[PDB]
Design a protein around this nucleic acid. Sequence first.
RNA 1: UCAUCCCGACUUACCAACCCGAUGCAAACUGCGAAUACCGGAGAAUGUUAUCACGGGAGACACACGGCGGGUGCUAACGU
RNA 2: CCUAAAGAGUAACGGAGGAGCACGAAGGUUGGCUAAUCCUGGUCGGACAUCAGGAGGUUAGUGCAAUGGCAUAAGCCAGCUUGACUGCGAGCGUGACGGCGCGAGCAGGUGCGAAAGCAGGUCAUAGUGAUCCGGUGGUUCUGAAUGGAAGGGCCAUCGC
RNA 3: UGCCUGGCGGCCGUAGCGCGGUGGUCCCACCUGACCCCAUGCCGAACUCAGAAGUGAAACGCCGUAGCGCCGAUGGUAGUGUGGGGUCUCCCCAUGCGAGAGUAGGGAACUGCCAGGCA
RNA 4: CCCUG
RNA 5: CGGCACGUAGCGCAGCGGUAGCGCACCGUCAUGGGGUGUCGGGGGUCGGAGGUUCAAAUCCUCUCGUGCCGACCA
Lengths: 60, 51, 177, 78, 116, 136
Amino acid sequence: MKKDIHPKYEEITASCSCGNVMKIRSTVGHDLNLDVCSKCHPFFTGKQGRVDRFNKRFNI
Amino acid sequence: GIREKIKLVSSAGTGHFYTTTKNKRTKPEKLELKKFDPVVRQHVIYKEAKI
Amino acid sequence: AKLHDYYKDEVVKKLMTEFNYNSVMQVPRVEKITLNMGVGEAIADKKLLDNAAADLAAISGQKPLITKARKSVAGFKIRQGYPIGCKVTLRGERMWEFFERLITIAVPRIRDFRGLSAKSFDGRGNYSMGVREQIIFPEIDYDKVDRVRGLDITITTTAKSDEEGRALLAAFDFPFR
Amino acid sequence: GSTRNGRDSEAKRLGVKRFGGESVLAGSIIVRQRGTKFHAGANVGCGRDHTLFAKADGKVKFEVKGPKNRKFISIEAE
Amino acid sequence: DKKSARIRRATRARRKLQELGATRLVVHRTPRHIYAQVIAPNGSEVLVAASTVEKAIAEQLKYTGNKDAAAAVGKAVAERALEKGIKDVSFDRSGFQYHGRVQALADAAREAGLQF
Amino acid sequence: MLQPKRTKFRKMHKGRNRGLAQGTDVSFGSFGLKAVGRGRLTARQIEAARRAMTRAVKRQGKIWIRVFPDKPITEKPLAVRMGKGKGNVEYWVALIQPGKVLYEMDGVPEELAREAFKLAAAKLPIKTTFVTKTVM
RNA sequence: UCAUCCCGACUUACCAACCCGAUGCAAACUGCGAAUACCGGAGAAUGUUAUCACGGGAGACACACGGCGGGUGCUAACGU
RNA sequence: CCUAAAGAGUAACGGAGGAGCACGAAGGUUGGCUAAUCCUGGUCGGACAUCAGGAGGUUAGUGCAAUGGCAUAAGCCAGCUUGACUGCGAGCGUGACGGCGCGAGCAGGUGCGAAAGCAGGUCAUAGUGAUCCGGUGGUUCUGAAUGGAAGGGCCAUCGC
RNA sequence: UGCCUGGCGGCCGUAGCGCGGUGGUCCCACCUGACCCCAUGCCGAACUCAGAAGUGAAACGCCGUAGCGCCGAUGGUAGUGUGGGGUCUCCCCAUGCGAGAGUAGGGAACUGCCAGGCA
RNA sequence: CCCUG
RNA sequence: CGGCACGUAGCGCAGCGGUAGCGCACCGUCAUGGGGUGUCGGGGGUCGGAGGUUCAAAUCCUCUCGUGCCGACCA
Ligand SMILES: [Mg+2]
Ligand SMILES: [Mg+2]
Ligand SMILES: [Mg+2]
Ligand SMILES: [Mg+2]
Ligand SMILES: [Mg+2]
Ligand SMILES: [Mg+2]
Ligand SMILES: [Mg+2]
Ligand SMILES: [Mg+2]
Ligand SMILES: [Mg+2]
Ligand SMILES: [Mg+2]
Ligand SMILES: [Mg+2]
Ligand SMILES: [Mg+2]
Ligand SMILES: [Mg+2]
Ligand SMILES: [Mg+2]
Ligand SMILES: [Mg+2]
Ligand SMILES: [Mg+2]
Ligand SMILES: [Mg+2]
Ligand SMILES: [Mg+2]
Ligand SMILES: [Mg+2]
Ligand SMILES: [Mg+2]
Ligand SMILES: [Zn+2]
């Protein structure tokens, strides 16, 4: 750490739409509104045929 | 070939000069060096002057 | 910092459990995390290097090296010592805050995200990864960017092998696929 | 026909001037060389073209020393 | 590694002093302790030695790796070198930067009587 | 016609051919043609001898050529005064001392190998002889 | 050759980088290395000081062959 | 560089290459650092641009040819500077000579370093030209009856 | 007096690599923090400072082990000075010197001063 | 400018 | 035999450390009943071959095999 060359850097609150709040030390200044966090991504949660469509299509 | 001779004359006013070579194509600015002057016995500013 | 607390409080003894070591500092640590961005078009325009350096300062919270060419290469029209990249190195609480930023913001924001490759290790336990669009990063805002840009990330650790490194990253729940 | 060769330089008179066991005066040249083929030991100076000279009177004496097996020239004072 | 790097740093000064043939005040610094030896120009025989591992220093000093440690061991090595009768030694930082503990050592020796 | 693919220098001193050769042992194969006299061998002589060996034996066994013409020989063209520069390179030789195993061969019956070596020796310009692999 | 968008699957009339094992060569190669030679010191004998310095006078600066080490030439020349 | 025969030297219209410069930093010191090449991983990026790790150990580098050097680096980076100083010089090498070169130390002043110390150019060896005749600046040293001056001398330097 | 550890040397591979094992009371190293002394062409990575919770993991030291590197005979061979000789491009004899390579074998260093811990 | 016999 | 001049698209020619250029020609469309001329719009080159330095070679060097020129004289 020098002085007076690094970009300006304070604590920031961020809020994800799944009801999540977290506490992140950053540079943009203003607080963050987040689309998706690690607690609600489909991959992270884990939530991520021809004969059957033929039978359901042309069932006899 | 392109380096040409210059004389560094003293600022002590005694008319004493060293002589060097300089590349004026690369560096148009003059040359000032604190070097020894034998008649005033002091290290004094020698500045560039033409031959 | 809270990731470091998570490390020191649970990850070390978990590593102890499944690896049956003799030392709590046989349990591996993260040696350094360095961020590179090769801006090789600086020979076309040195100013976009300055814009890119500002962007990498924005993500890093840290002034970057403007790194120059090691040896002149004919094919890319570069001379030795020509500034063609930007880099930072991150250590300590900066590891932990930036790693928190990554694992809790950036990888949810990857466009068409399906997890990271576990085969990205270099054979010595150190991990590397490539980000294509820095706009997934909230440290930079949308309409003030000039060009689409990417970067690459390396986490160098003291782990002696790839299974060691992937076990450590799975302890940090790094999204392998 | 014609030749592209035919050039040479004057020989530089290199080599050891004062061999092992000489009595030397101060400032006498021991070895003229290109580079430190022989290195300077005690009471021996290495002039700017790597010329080894005796800084003091005495008897000149060759050795091999060091971890890399280099030849050193010293002056054992009489 | 760091030990071989420090040896590589110190080698130039050590061979310069060995060619000049002056008595050497060599410092060695560890995170916990510091050691100082005044040794003969032959490079094989010590004259005096003083270190923070000695009881007669560690009993009155609190911690052995600080400026107070450096100043005390410099004072101590200074009077033992004077009573052995040297008065003239050349410093040997042994690859450590002339700063902090090594600087405090040299200042302690210089104020307590050695000239270098 | 054997020749090095590239060399450090285009011309070479005349030199001398003193001493006795090493490589005096059959190394790879079993049956060898070994020099007894002393002299040079032109790459053309090597090629002619090798052709005689291979087409006498009719492609059985295997042939090792234990010499290589590395030495360039100059010749000054005719009606040219002495001096005015070393002559141009003309052909390549191999300096062969006594006791040099010149040719070597394997996989062939003894009488056939002896006959093929007889044709080879007839093409060679120097004294040769037949040698047999010894276990030491 | 099979499939021929990425992919990919076969055989080599074959050619072969690195490394390993083994055999050579080098005036402009040396991880080795003589005999001689050369410098210096000590010692005995021998030599009409044979050694060095300074001064007077020159001549000579077209060499030849033979031995050994070589360049060049054709390891040709009573060649160079 | 070889020929050149293990001191020096040694010829040919013998065998191969270079120079007629460059640099006020590419010099002085102080402090720090270590290369080529290959493999693995990774966004554009591909065989080769940047990064990380590993092997390797100078196969790199040296302002420019080759040889001999160089890790204590002479190689790379940064800070501060002008010793690329002035008058000398024990002694020595090398030349037929003109000359050329190394040089501890002394006196004056300086730079770097906390100091010991180092510095009278660059890793060394090429990058050059006698003398005459003049030109420029300083120095009363001389100055054709005397005072000056011109001219001349000395020192610095310029023109093949 | 003995063992272990650190520093400085002697010596410069018989001493260096590799493989296996072993050590932390002390020492050493890793280490814990660093707004401060200082420092990073960014990073307390290095360097520096303030300490001593944990670890001998890495490092380092020690021990064993020839898979190597290394050393290395006796004799022989090559070469060569001097004198002679031949079938004289090259060799031989008398005599003096005598390699390099290789083989048997050796070899997992030895040692000085001071300081510290234990007995 | 030319227009296969 | 010795120099010295050049090997660039199918042809003729420029360019002689970082870029390959001009004309004729070929192709496609217009104009014509049709051809030519004309008009519009394109493309095309291991830079003779090989290997050396350099970050890089058409340009710098060496050799190479082609074609041209000038001398191969006193006896
Ligand atoms: Mg004459
Ligand atoms: Mg003559
Ligand atoms: Mg003669
Ligand atoms: Mg004759
Ligand atoms: Mg010689
Ligand atoms: Mg000789
Ligand atoms: Mg002579
Ligand atoms: Mg240094
Ligand atoms: Mg330098
Ligand atoms: Mg330099
Ligand atoms: Mg130079
Ligand atoms: Mg007058
Ligand atoms: Mg008058
Ligand atoms: Mg005047
Ligand atoms: Mg630390
Ligand atoms: Mg261990
Ligand atoms: Mg031997
Ligand atoms: Mg061992
Ligand atoms: Mg017509
Ligand atoms: Mg006539
Ligand atoms: Zn969420």
